[PDB]
Symmetry: C3
Amino acid sequence: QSVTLPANSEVTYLSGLLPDPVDPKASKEQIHAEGNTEAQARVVLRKVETILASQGLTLGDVVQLRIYLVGDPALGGKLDFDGLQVAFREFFGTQKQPLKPARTTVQVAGLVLPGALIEVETVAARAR
Amino acid sequence: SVTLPANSEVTYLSGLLPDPVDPKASKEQIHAEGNTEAQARVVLRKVETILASQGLTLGDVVQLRIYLVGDPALGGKLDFDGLQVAFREFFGTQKQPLKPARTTVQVAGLVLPGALIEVETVAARA
Amino acid sequence: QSVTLPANSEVTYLSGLLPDPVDPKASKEQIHAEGNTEAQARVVLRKVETILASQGLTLGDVVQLRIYLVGDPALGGKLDFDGLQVAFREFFGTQKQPLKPARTTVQVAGLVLPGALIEVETVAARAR
């Protein structure tokens, strides 16, 4: 629905995050990601957690999540939203972390990393 | 461009979709219908209503991001004019003349089949 | 990586910026932009520079850059990330302007200006 930031909030913007290449040491021309949308989303949400934690922030501090999916051929070229929702539910609305941010999921035509099916963009804010 | 004073209270909405043509139909048949003008009218009303339930109006909007899909009924063509027909009913009006920061891009699809528009909103009251 | 704003920040939101059409007075049916991604990104990033300067802001004040690319027909419909990077680096991470904002680059299906290969959306803030 909606999230409201107090005027005393400290706001942190992340770059869009992609899954890790299977070999981060591969050449610029063979660097690529593997896995289906659910697997890749799980990797990317963990990266968000890790980056946020290194700032003293938690997944409960997320105020806005923008998720860009690439269509999966097995799904008629459509975005794999069900795969995404599985991973997303492991990280948000659970008991370790109950909160859910404002979010948006759209199907894009492509991402910069070959084989990547998901990129996530994050805004977090710690009230004060 | 819009500049927020440092005393602003800022609100983020989730992306908003039009309503399915049959919300009780099965999981694979859920879908939206209508052209861009009609679907934009449903979505902008949801934005209006959600904002009102928080004490905010369309004048409080600072950033509108609009994702359009090509219209299947027109062979996948982008119906930007339809969007602008609906959009003008809500913004740049006389009750509230101001214009928010906005972005309109054509995405490949939305999570609701047949949906041609999603709107993402940022609002702030001093 | 990440950019975090103190709660003293004044935040500025720009509309998405497109490259200029090759004939701004051409018909609604022939209006179109030209050039490859690197050329257009250089035009679009300049509009960001110019608009910020007119607001008392600099490119170092940019906190978030969202870049939407259209696939280049000359690239089989692939996004021209290398062209984008050439242009982007003339503007961010230089020696006069060292800062780099949180950014996201994704490939969309289309933009509202035919022939446009890039739109850039900007959020800026000067701390106080």
